[PDB]
Symmetry: D2
Subunit: 425 residues, 4 copies
């Protein structure tokens, strides 16, 4: 029951709801002053530019960004890079922070209790298909090929599923499907992740990407908001409820994935822990990145900040600066040091005689003279002092900064401010 | 201690901070779903477009909007009509809602406790002169003539004062000055407002417009934030502390007021109660408004929403529609009815045989056939039913809707929904 | 060749080219200082906002505006209302005026000689389907349903045809089709318009809307640009050449027309003479307009100018102002006069005791006291003096102003400045 | 007449007119497809971003850009980087190309015959002080210190003069002043530039920056447009006319220059010939640039294009890429080559084994494998083939490309297309 012009009308009758929401507690000290969607990525992006540029390029120009925890950077970023819309053309990016009225009320008890507080505003949009996007994730998806796959099957809810290794399948929503892609068994974040049939080493996992018949969502949240034992969550409460009525279908992600190399596998990185954040950025620095960002058929929109060109200058001794598989964004000033496998964001000043290897330097970092950096993540505005050594003595990096179990170091201003180093340059 | 070009450099060394903040509890039900700065005004404005367009036309392009209570409409309005800035030219409108973490903290204890939570962000602006604007007020001021008076007097704090009648001086900050415009005695919201010398019928009142030496403000809040018995307010705690050191000067508003008729008195309306809101809008509908809005030397910037022309059509009987001293904004459709002394905002539909007199019809109102309206304020999206009569029986309007002591009626959806009228259009 | 998602990919592979181009000599004095696409219409629109908002809502966000004659107002209008695009998202409105060098060259010899001068720029867009839009016309078309019909018939060129009366078929490119919508006989602006089969009173006319295979267009212009006897026009030279090879199909306009009343006929006004301009605007003033402009599923984008509400005030004698089936846009100030069947654009000042009937008052017009206006078009910024009478003596309106054969008067500043009246208010 | 607030009101009463105008014939082939104001500079700027960002930061937000020769790139640049204005706040960038009506009229005969053709539009702005800016020049000037010095002296015209070497003074307007900065003798482009008193090696030259009383300008052009012996130029016709009446004063540029190092001399480069274009860009690459572009108190606004970070990758052999005193803007991809004293603009692709020394690589250049480049300017989109050698054999670089007398090479697509190299990558 699909018309030949159906692929262009369904995005125009649809509304996306990005659950920027809370944080990732697994990113110890990267998030303490920001939400996980506002974590920097890619030299110039934040994570929420991925869950927003896929709505645009999918025709969905009606988004709803639900923000609760440390949203000042997020909201300022939406204001400055996602406020080119005109509300007359049926397009907007509405911010829906919890409405504060009394002393301390209305704080969004859950993921599914944030779309129910704002259920008097979303009704006004008059949307038939509600995409429910987790916007703390990194991907390149076309939701006008998932909306169709939702409309062909005659479904009421449509969960985007993609297989992942059973080792990491205890952190996502594992399901089980049939020949018609109907969800039979759904369980959220199990302790013993069930495997797929014919693939014992992999589990069919939910990505946090639900498409909903709007008439069904509203009747499902109002029918769940009165539940006293509910935890108010899509995975932990609702999707089991839809599944047990047999109204929940599964949409494979490889179908609706935008990738420039069809021979490759789909790219999904959720930046769960610190190690996967670091590994995810340097993938862009390699020679053949898994994530294409020089792609013009699916571009990513962000805050086009005005920065001068990246300047490389001679050190105090007149010598050269060497580079190898690195990204140097605008504003940077690298005074003749060695930079390898690194990602430097905007306005990173790197003075002389430094050595930087497999590092990620978030913006406005100042590296002092004669510093050695190996396998680290330097947070925003960190003023590294002269002669600092990082990533060569694991026993001396665990008791100064934070050091993951896999060997990744994280540097913040508070970590440096606690050792006496002044961070007011 | 002045200079030739000083009048142009100080707005650029300056930063404004709009305390959009809380509400006006004296605006009974007009605010229950919005902040007082987001109350509509003038057919197309909100109140915070006055405290923001005086920063632009005074050269202050660095503003800081502090929003706590019901800011969804406010933040959406700033997003859509005040997001044309480019952060590279040293200009921005930063939104500073209270940072929420752990799900119940940081709720801004006071007016002066909202500039102390955000005192790590405002330092980054590197501003010498901090203008502190109450943005729930209506005026036309030039803060590049108040900054000079502050920079021409050697002041540390400079309170904009204007005289008001002693009857209404119990709701503002009454002060007392000397021959050099030095504040001698300041008391906040007295029960017996002291009169001026030589003018027993009027009191010298603070408008809520403080200009501050930045070096003094940061040292004054951090010296006040540690106080456990303080109420955390500019008027109630800080301005007496500055006054008692003799570092607080007074800047008369008639000097820095922008008015097209120099023979007139300065215009200040803080839309305190309901009655002054109604009286303030209809002042624009009279023949000679006290507030000039057809002024091109000091224009007011707002959300230029795309609306069709105001349409006047014949009623069901083919008859004419009469108008008398009224404002009809864009989108409106008036089907042959009588409109007098009224202000119709955007998208107001007025069906046949209506009679509307001294009314204010906030946006998206639908008036049904054969309605009579007198001395009323119809709130957003109210769907008035057919044959409703308002403003002719005071005993029958007080038990349906809200009716002030002076005779002004207010109509909301909740008031109409409670009488059985369906508000689903 | 009709794939599930073909309806959404073809607009992105497409590029529109608006031939704003020359003028309408049949608009005697309305155009003398502007291009016909920049003629005002609708109270707030210009004609080129129709050929541009149909590209946006059809997904075609890459437009090319070819401007030659008096484009100052046009270019300024595109600059201020059509410059919200970001070139990184594959979207833009490129202005392509003739490139002037040596002070006397490159002046666009024809309609199809304007897309050949800019053919070193349009190749860079890398477009497969080139829509060729005449943008001096008024309609509501969906070019993502003409593009489908173009890709599902296997066509190389596809001319949008609609039947019109044989009495107005001498100014269009009349064709003749077959059962498969293949153009058999095309002749451009005949003296005896051939009729349709079974409809002797109507002719199947070209609207000026060609969709082209881009690989065919470039090879057709370069194969025509070398022709010495060609007139360099799409109708007079190219479309006959395509037709005579049998590669030209016809797309009926009723299929790809957006109208809110399916029972109605498609709306197409070329605003040819003066009489159809006047008649076209007042259709919006009637009770049931043929053109829906309160439509939210196909809105029209324009210069959203910041204007105050429409003010109606009492005249010198304290009397009422009456209105009947009229449009009053923003900025207007009507001092107690009678306005009937009229359309007032922005900033129209109408002083006391006026009588205005079936008029169109283009922007910034000042009507003086005691003026009577009937069946007229008042041009931009015309300062009508006190006691002027228009539309009651045809013999006295033909020797002052311009008066069409049908009774429509046109008033310009030059017509009024020639009678001695000062036009410098 | 030095009023307290005069420094802030005069920019708002003022209007700037950038004579983007014609070309520099002295830039042999750099300009053949663009105007000299649209020549690229600085890695991301064009020259007219200098004559435009000084109006913004000087408070002048009403600009008028007069464009005649090859303005497609210029106009597109203003459209995309200088169209953030709102005409309601009294601010705009009006483009004023010559009006074409019949078939080859209205071709700006001179510099001063372009402000006379557009004299019906500039009267509408209602400006008292008309700044006349040559926008083919590079500087950092504050015109709110030049407008004041014009108003203190009680002048009618105020020519910004700065001393330059007598060797290059035959290309500017040499004048002679008195103790009160009154112009005594003005002569335009002499063959023997007269020297200054006490500085025989230097001449007091006009920069092309005239401030005018508007009531005098309109009366001077209309009194000059009717002259049959006039050449219609500010220098060659008008400024002698003002000087011979004694109404022309001189404003030294060092007063109103914005420079971060007060010990330095003012920076003025007219980018005359090819050699001063190359030398002007590489000045930004040195360690201490003469032009500060990391200045936040006087930033330069431009088309903030969305480009990915600058990527450095390993060559085919796995080796390092070295850099020394170079600028690499965004989009670039340098595959392990040596870059010295260079300036790479956006989207410059540099394949392996290249050697680049004192080069300027304008955008979208592709350098092939094993290329050596020395003292060259590679124009837009040049696709350099594999193994090309430039700047090592002057006799072999003069008969291929263009080579100045000083040794600077210029490479264009037409120069490469004529040697057989395909330039369609
Ligand atoms: N230059 C800076 N110095 C110190 N903190 C900053 C700076 N810029 C931003 N921040 C803060 O760093 C935190 C993270 O911001 P961001 O890295 O932009 O998400 C927020 O608390 C910001 O206010
Ligand atoms: N058309 C409408 N119908 C019902 N409520 C509305 C409508 N438009 C806005 N609102 C709500 O009215 C309240 C006040 O919004 P505002 O009048 O824009 O300050 C908010 O809760 C809005 O979400
Ligand atoms: N207020 C005005 N008074 C006189 N001429 C105007 C005014 N506004 C625009 N024009 C001119 O009227 C012509 C048509 O402009 P437009 O009506 O905008 O297409 C152009 O030559 C404009 O410069
Ligand atoms: N990628 C490209 N390939 C060939 N020509 C181009 C390219 N980009 C711009 N041009 C042309 O180069 C000339 C100069 O443009 P610009 O360098 O932008 O001033 C104009 O004719 C442009 O249309």
């Amino acid at each position: 029951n699909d018309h030949l012009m159906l692929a262009r009308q369904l995005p125009l009758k649809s509304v996306a709801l990005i659950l920027a929401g809370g944080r990732g507690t697994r990113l110890k000290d990267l998030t303490n002053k920001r939400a996980k969607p506002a974590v920097h990525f890619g030299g110039k992006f934040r994570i929420i530019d991925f869950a927003l540029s896929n709505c645009i390029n999918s025709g969905i120009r009606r988004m709803g960004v639900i923000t609760q925890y440390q949203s000042h950077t997020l909201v300022q970023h939406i204001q400055r890079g996602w406020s080119f819309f005109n509300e007359e053309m049926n397009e907007f990016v509405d911010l829906l922070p919890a409405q504060q009225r009394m002393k301390g009320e209305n704080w969004y008890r859950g993921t599914a209790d944030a779309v129910t507080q704002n259920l008097d505003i979303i009704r006004r949009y008059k949307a038939e298909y509600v995409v429910i996007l987790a916007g703390d994730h990194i991907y390149k998806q076309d939701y006008s090929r998932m909306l169709i796959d939702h409309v062909e099957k005659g479904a009421r809810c449509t969960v985007a599923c993609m297989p992942v290794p059973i080792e990491e399948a205890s952190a996502f929503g594992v399901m089980a499907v049939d020949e018609n892609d109907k969800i039979i068994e759904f369980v959220e974040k199990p302790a013993n992740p069930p495997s797929m049939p014919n693939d014992p080493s992999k589990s069919l996992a939910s990505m946090g990407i639900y498409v909903f018949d709007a008439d069904y969502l509203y009747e499902l949240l109002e029918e769940d908001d009165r539940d006293e034992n509910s935890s108010h969550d899509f995975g932990k409460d609702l999707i089991p409820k839809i599944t047990e009525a047999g109204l929940a279908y599964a949409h494979p992600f490889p179908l609706s994935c935008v990738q420039s190399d069809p021979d490759a596998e789909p790219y999904w990185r959720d930046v769960g822990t610190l190690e996967a954040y670091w590994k995810a950025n340097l993938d862009l620095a390699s020679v053949v990145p898994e994530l294409d960002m020089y792609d013009r058929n699916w571009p990513i929109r962000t805050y086009n900040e005005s920065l001068p060109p990246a300047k490389f200058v001679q050190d105090r001794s007149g010598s050269h600066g060497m580079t190898l598989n690195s990204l140097v964004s605008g504003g940077c000033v690298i005074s003749g040091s060695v930079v390898v496998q690194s990602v430097l964001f905007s306005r990173v000043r790197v003075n002389s005689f430094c050595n930087i290897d497999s590092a990620v330097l978030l913006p406005e970092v100042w590296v002092g003279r004669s510093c050695r950096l190996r396998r680290c993540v330097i947070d925003r505005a960190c003023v590294i002092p002269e002669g600092m050594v990082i990533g060569e003595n694991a026993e001396e990096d665990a008791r100064r900064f934070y050091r993951s179990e896999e060997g990744i170091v994280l540097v913040t201003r508070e970590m440096l401010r606690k050792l006496g180093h002044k961070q007011e340059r």
